């Protein structure tokens, strides 16, 4: 209903376009990522017999996981859909609607261009290592670490960068539209 | 039926509160359940100490954390939102057969800011700030002299705690404003 409930109230593009790649990503997240990652600190292993050396590499190389950072940004961009249907739903039950609207999708380009953003700065490119060296203390001199399940969620990543991509391109051709029909 | 209590709520509420409490309180709800929940989910599990006594770990784990942060997070949710639901059933049971109904909102929204602010200022006092520590130094019996021990995901638990916080703060402000708002209008 939820779906159903927000099916009216957009132009073509943003009738489906946006709102089955939205499903794509749940789906995505739900169904299949969240088992790739359900042991990320149970199969870390690191060459030492210090005691705390992998808690603080872990910790170090790892400072939010994946599938949290996803998390968050489906929670971001879905509210301002969700809040400007709820806007004009109890009315219900054209400038003013014009003005929100055009608002709506203009934050959605922000939070999906920040949080891409993160990403790239955050963990150094969008492919994962087999190995971290790690020296921070109370680890001796330097540490191998090795990662768990580097080359699954290298693929998890890509295909979730280059979904995001694609909803930012609907956004911004939805804006043109709205920009030269005033 | 999240959809259908929440919007016998909506019922009798100004701009702010129709729309930004509430899409605030599902906010927190939503970063509590399908996020952060399970960031703690091996508090204890991974918890490190550098000793051989046993016993040792029980203590310190329960000296440093007495009480988890996700199940604070849980019980100001619900404390905040009894108020909700006393007012919706109690109208509804002199609905089934303005003042009253002023004097009931009013004190609604002034027990909603004294949990917040009561919440929030036991995270403060009882864990010294809003970050976590890599490394914790305990002392308490059975351990010996002073023991080493470590933390679990210290970054991520301080970024969820800043998180809950800074919106937990917000909610502050328009409970506030809607206070002043409803006072003028007499």
Not at 121 to 127: A, E, I, K, L, T
Request: aromatic fraction near 16%; charge should be positive.
């Amino acid at each position: 209903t939820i779906l159903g409930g927000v099916n009216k109230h957009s132009t073509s593009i943003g009738k489906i376009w946006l709102t089955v790649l939205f499903i794509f990503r749940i789906m995505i997240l739900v169904v299949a990522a969240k088992e790739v990652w359900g042991d990320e600190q149970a199969d870390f292993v690191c060459n030492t017999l210090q005691p705390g050396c992998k808690n603080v590499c872990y910790d170090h190389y790892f400072p939010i996981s994946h599938i949290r950072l996803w998390a968050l940004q489906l929670i971001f961009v879905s509210t301002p859909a969700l809040l400007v249907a709820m806007h004009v739903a109890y009315r219900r039950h054209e400038g003013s609607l014009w003005w929100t609207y055009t608002s709506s999708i203009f934050f959605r380009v922000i939070f999906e261009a920040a949080f891409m953003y993160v990403f790239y700065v955050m963990y150094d490119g969008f492919s994962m290592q087999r190995l971290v060296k790690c020296n921070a203390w109370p680890c001796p001199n330097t540490v191998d670490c090795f990662v768990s399940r580097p080359t699954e969620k290298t693929v998890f990543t890509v295909f979730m960068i280059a979904v995001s991509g694609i909803c930012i391109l609907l956004n911004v051709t939805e804006l043109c539209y709205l920009l030269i029909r005033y």
